[PDB]
Amino acid sequence: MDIDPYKEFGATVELLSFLPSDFFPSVRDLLDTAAALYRDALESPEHASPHHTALRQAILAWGDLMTLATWVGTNLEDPASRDLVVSYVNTNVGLKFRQLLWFHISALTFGRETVLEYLVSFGVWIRTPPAYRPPNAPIL
Amino acid sequence: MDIDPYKEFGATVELLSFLPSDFFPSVRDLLDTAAALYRDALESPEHASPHHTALRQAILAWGDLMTLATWVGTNLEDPASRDLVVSYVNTNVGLKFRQLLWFHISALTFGRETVLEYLVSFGVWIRTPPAYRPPNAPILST
Amino acid sequence: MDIDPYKEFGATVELLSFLPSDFFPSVRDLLDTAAALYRDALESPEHASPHHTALRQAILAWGDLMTLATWVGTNLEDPASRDLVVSYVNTNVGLKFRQLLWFHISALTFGRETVLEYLVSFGVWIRTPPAYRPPNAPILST
Amino acid sequence: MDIDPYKEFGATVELLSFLPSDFFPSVRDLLDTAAALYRDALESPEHASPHHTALRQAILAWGDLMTLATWVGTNLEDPASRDLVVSYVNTNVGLKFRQLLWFHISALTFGRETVLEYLVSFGVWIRTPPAYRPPNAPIL
Amino acid sequence: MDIDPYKEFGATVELLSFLPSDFFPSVRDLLDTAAALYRDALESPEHASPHHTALRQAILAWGDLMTLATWVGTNLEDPASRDLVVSYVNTNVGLKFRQLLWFHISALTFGRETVLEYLVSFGVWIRTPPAYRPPNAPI
Amino acid sequence: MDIDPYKEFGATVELLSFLPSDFFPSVRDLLDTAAALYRDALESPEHASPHHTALRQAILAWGDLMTLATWVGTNLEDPASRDLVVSYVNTNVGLKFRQLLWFHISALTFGRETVLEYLVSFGVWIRTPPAYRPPNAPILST
Ligand SMILES: COc1ccccc1/C(Br)=C(/NC(=O)c1ccc([N+](=O)[O-])cc1)C(=O)N1CCCCC1
Ligand SMILES: COc1ccccc1/C(Br)=C(/NC(=O)c1ccc([N+](=O)[O-])cc1)C(=O)N1CCCCC1
Ligand SMILES: COc1ccccc1/C(Br)=C(/NC(=O)c1ccc([N+](=O)[O-])cc1)C(=O)N1CCCCC1
Numbered sequence: 001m002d003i004d005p006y007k008e009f010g011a012t013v014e015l016l017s018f019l020p021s022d023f024f025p026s027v028r029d030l031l032d033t034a035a036a037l038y039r040d041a042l043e044s045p046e047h048a049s050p051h052h053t054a055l056r057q058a059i060l061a062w063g064d065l066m067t068l069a070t071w072v073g074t075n076l077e078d079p080a081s082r083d084l085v086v087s088y089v090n091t092n093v094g095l096k097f098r099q100l101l102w103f104h105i106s107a108l109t110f111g112r113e114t115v116l117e118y119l120v121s122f123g124v125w126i127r128t129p130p131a132y133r134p135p136n137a138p139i140l
Numbered sequence: 141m142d143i144d145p146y147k148e149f150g151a152t153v154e155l156l157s158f159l160p161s162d163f164f165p166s167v168r169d170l171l172d173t174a175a176a177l178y179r180d181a182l183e184s185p186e187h188a189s190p191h192h193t194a195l196r197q198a199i200l201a202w203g204d205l206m207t208l209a210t211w212v213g214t215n216l217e218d219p220a221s222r223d224l225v226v227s228y229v230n231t232n233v234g235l236k237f238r239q240l241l242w243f244h245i246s247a248l249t250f251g252r253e254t255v256l257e258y259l260v261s262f263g264v265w266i267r268t269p270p271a272y273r274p275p276n277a278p279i280l281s282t
Numbered sequence: 283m284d285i286d287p288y289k290e291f292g293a294t295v296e297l298l299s300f301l302p303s304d305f306f307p308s309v310r311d312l313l314d315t316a317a318a319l320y321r322d323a324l325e326s327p328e329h330a331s332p333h334h335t336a337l338r339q340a341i342l343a344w345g346d347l348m349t350l351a352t353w354v355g356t357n358l359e360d361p362a363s364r365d366l367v368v369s370y371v372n373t374n375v376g377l378k379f380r381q382l383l384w385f386h387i388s389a390l391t392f393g394r395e396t397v398l399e400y401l402v403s404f405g406v407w408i409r410t411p412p413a414y415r416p417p418n419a420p421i422l423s424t
Numbered sequence: 425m426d427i428d429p430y431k432e433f434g435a436t437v438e439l440l441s442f443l444p445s446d447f448f449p450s451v452r453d454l455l456d457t458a459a460a461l462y463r464d465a466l467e468s469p470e471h472a473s474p475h476h477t478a479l480r481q482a483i484l485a486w487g488d489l490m491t492l493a494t495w496v497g498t499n500l501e502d503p504a505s506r507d508l509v510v511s512y513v514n515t516n517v518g519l520k521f522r523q524l525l526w527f528h529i530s531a532l533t534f535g536r537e538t539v540l541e542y543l544v545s546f547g548v549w550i551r552t553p554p555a556y557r558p559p560n561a562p563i564l
Numbered sequence: 565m566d567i568d569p570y571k572e573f574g575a576t577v578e579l580l581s582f583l584p585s586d587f588f589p590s591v592r593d594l595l596d597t598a599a600a601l602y603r604d605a606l607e608s609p610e611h612a613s614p615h616h617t618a619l620r621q622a623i624l625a626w627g628d629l630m631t632l633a634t635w636v637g638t639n640l641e642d643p644a645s646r647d648l649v650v651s652y653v654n655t656n657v658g659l660k661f662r663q664l665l666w667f668h669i670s671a672l673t674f675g676r677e678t679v680l681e682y683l684v685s686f687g688v689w690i691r692t693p694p695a696y697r698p699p700n701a702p703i
Numbered sequence: 704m705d706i707d708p709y710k711e712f713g714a715t716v717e718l719l720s721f722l723p724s725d726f727f728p729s730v731r732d733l734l735d736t737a738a739a740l741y742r743d744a745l746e747s748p749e750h751a752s753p754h755h756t757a758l759r760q761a762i763l764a765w766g767d768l769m770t771l772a773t774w775v776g777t778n779l780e781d782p783a784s785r786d787l788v789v790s791y792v793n794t795n796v797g798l799k800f801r802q803l804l805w806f807h808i809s810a811l812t813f814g815r816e817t818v819l820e821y822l823v824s825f826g827v828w829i830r831t832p833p834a835y836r837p838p839n840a841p842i843l844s845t
Pocket of ligand 3: 589593594597665666669670673674678679682701703
């Protein structure tokens with residue numbers, strides 16, 4: 001089955017192909033962000049905004065990917081393969097995740113629309129070749 | 141940090157611990173069940189009940205977990221520890237999803253509250269002695 | 283080209299795949315059941331519910347399929363491949379009809395929606411483990 | 425059991441005995457017609473007119489007669505009988521079918537009554553002997 | 565990514581390939597027809613309907629086909645440098661144009677919705693029993 | 704063929720030929736973006752703004768050029784069956800698209816008039832010396 005996690009929110013990975021894997025901040029940098037004004041706002045039985053409602057999944061979806069990524073470092077009798085495992089999740093999988101995460105965050109913070117209003121202004125800064133590219137990205 | 145996916149829906153793994161791991165029907169059986177009247181209604185920009193919303197992740201997290209477990213069975217040189225992955229996935233943790241999955245799924249079929257008023261029955265069904273406990277377990281009918 | 287007979291009625295073979303082929307009662311048993319309060323009400327210029335309408339074809343297509351299969355058992359010179367017809371008809375595809383048949387039939391007895399709210403139960407009945415799953419399968423009562 | 429597939433629609437095979445097997449166009453010629461403004465109008469969950477509602481059956485009723493008429497050309501160890509099979513369906517059975525099909529089609533297209541208004545004007549052109557028969561058939 | 569250049573209001577491709585592909589007049593017989601009273605009208609910086617627009621590309625896009633498909637037997641080497649050039653065009657995709665083009669054009673003659681009422685009023689008169697069917701195609 | 708697809712929108716090829724041919728991002732980068740919030744908007748039966756319609760062609764017109772660069776290596780064994788295939792494409796007669804494409808898209812999302820006024824006060828950059836011209840010339844998102 002193929003569905004777009006963003007779809008409903010009005011987004012689509014179709015435009016996330018651009019975003020360089022070095023864009024969104026490392027996972028931990030976000031995990032700490034969970035302690036924001038959002039920490040409490042989740043351990044509370046309230047749907048509120050469908051945003052977190054889903055995030056809360058990804059969180060644990062990973063909350064397990066971190067409670068299992070450790071079940072590897074222990075019960076494992078092959079000290080030559082467990083070195084090429086975490087070298088995929090925290091790298092090639094954090095990617096198709098850091099976005100999944102970061103996303104929601106940077107939407108509740110200020111506003112949803114206020115975000116798309118960027119992805120677009122970015123989805124032009126990226127394509128447009130280097131030599132033909134100003135210093136940094138937009139603002140409001 | 142710990143939390144509960146069944147929060148806003150007024151629930152906790154606590155009551156899940158009642159449900160024997162070997163209860164929720166195999167994952168696939170559920171994935172297929174997705175094709176229900178609820179399948180085609182997911183690929184729509186409308187959030188609707190958070191059940192939908194949340195559900196996606198659980199799916200993705202898996203539909204991107206499976207398309208991950210099928211990555212090891214290809215890019216692996218030690219056939220000794222190749223089969224010790226499903227010894228956790230489809231098994232040890234599969235339920236960690238089967239619970240979620242089954243949950244939402246049903247919860248969406250027969251309303252929400254109409255669900256709790258179910259898992260609560262077992263909170264006494266299983267609890268009671270086998271000598272008395274009926275043979276047929278109460279399920280969702282009408 | 284592919285389509286689904288259970289379209290306008292909000293259904294798909296998808297949910298039928300759940301129903302074990304060996305579920306729908308033998309064709310004849312159904313043909314006879316046609317003689318129900320719904321039999322005499324077919325030979326009337328009134329379309330009424332499309333169930334009726336559609337039903338006819340399924341019947342004809344068969345009542346002109348059987349009066350066809352009984353054409354081979356007469357005009358055939360190779361008794362070796364004579365019995366390898368029912369090895370598809372009354373068997374391999376008989377269900378392709380038994381499904382339709384049974385479907386409409388019932389669907390007409392206990393309303394429509396009242397039907398989906400049935401096949402959906404099994405979408406969980408069968409799905410659940412045998413150790414828990416009750417002995418008696420829920421059916422149409424009142 | 426004996427019922428008239430047309431009955432309800434206000435018709436009856438009683439008058440189709442006339443219609444020469446060479447009348448209605450070959451099956452394929454109709455299958456292609458399915459791609460008309462009717463293609464989409466069926467793969468959609470709408471009863472609309474009881475017409476197609478039934479047709480949709482015949483379609484598959486045959487849709488299977490074409491998915492089984494092929495199960496013969498493969499799993500069959502008698503290259504002398506499968507030659508006298510399709511030489512019945514696409515011939516003596518297409519007959520008691522092409523009509524079953526064609527019918528509906530030529531009813532939704534313009535109108536139902538607008539059809540019977542013909543079967544009658546035809547159910548007179550046919551009987552009436554040859555020598556005593558104009559060039560072609562009517563119109564409106 | 566798949567769409568339908570005719571469904572820009574209510575038109576499918578099926579109904580085209582459904583019709584005798586032998587029917588749609590050659591391309592040349594259409595270009596020389598474009599240069600008609602409709603040529604000096606695509607030059608204008610505006611249009612009334614999209615037909616005009618859709619047409620430009622339909623042409624431009626094509627005008628870039630030949631202005632390019634002509635490089636098959638120039639400074640190139642091969643025994644059959646023109647086996648798919650004039651073929652693939654009058655056989656596959658290339659013909660789709662003979663359909664497309666043909667379309668818009670007439671669409672500007674007696675009108676638009678006066679055409680659709682034809683495709684049908686014909687897509688049938690063709691498949692109907694050539695012996696019992698009327699002699700004249702409806703309008 | 705003597706016409707200009709930009710004329711109807713008030714534009715001439717020159718207005719791009721002088722422009723950095725190598726500017727317009729790869730056809731790829733474009734086709735991808737196209738499927739942004741416009742993808743599902745073109746499939747629909749509404750041409751609304753001609754850009755749409757005209758665009759459809761471009762795609763198709765190309766969707767057969769992509770389907771064409773595939774028959775240039777089937778049963779062909781030439782000394783250049785994949786070397787000059789993209790000599791006119793990703794360079795000459797293939798740019799006609801990069802320009803076109805890029806064009807429309809931007810317009811639909813940035814009004815129209817405000818689109819031109821951009822390139823205008825831009826096709827000047829490349830004309831203005833490096834050390835003097837302010838390294839900016841943004842695409843106003845207002
Ligand atoms: C004008 O704003 C920006 C302008 C340019 C570039 C970035 C930003 C900022 Br805002 C963001 N960075 C974070 O929010 C963010 C979220 C979480 C963590 N974290 O994981 O701790 C770190 C950074 C950001 O990604 N956006 C994108 C959507 C609209 C604007 C904000
Ligand atoms: C005035 O009309 C006609 C006058 C004389 C003879 C025939 C016709 C035409 Br109309 C018809 N032919 C098709 O519709 C038809 C349907 C489907 C296919 N097909 O399978 O593609 C081919 C032909 C036709 O059978 N009728 C009978 C009912 C009233 C008039 C139309
Ligand atoms: C007397 O009417 C006819 C009687 C029988 C058959 C066809 C026609 C004619 Br008229 C047509 N031929 C062309 O338009 C046409 C347009 C452009 C080209 N072309 O590509 O050059 C070729 C043909 C035609 O398409 N229609 C459809 C709409 C109503 C008028 C007729």
